[PDB]
Amino acid sequence: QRLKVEDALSYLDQVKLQFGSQPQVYNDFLDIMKEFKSQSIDTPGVISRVSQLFKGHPDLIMGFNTFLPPG
Template sequence: MNNFNAGRIDRNGCIEEVKELFKGHRDLISGFNVFLPGSLEIADWYNLEGR
């Protein structure tokens, strides 16, 4: 999030960092999705496959 706030990465880069950080934690990914527009939500299959 710091990189996003500082303008070093864009919105998609921020989402990729969060996906890596929260990998394997479905509850955290679901909580983060609350703050994203529907078209940018991290899909449930991402977490279920352990990517």
């Protein structure tokens, strides 16, 4: 109702589409999420790393920050 998971998945496909020729950024993204999902880094670490993980395409990043709490 606020964040929605279905929208997140749609975003996942969008990333796989653009970087279809470079599945590297994809694996690195999800991998990071799992590291945070388990025990390794924190929230600021995921946001920063991912931000640098998509260096070159401010589009995906712009839409990615939308998910995170604004303010």
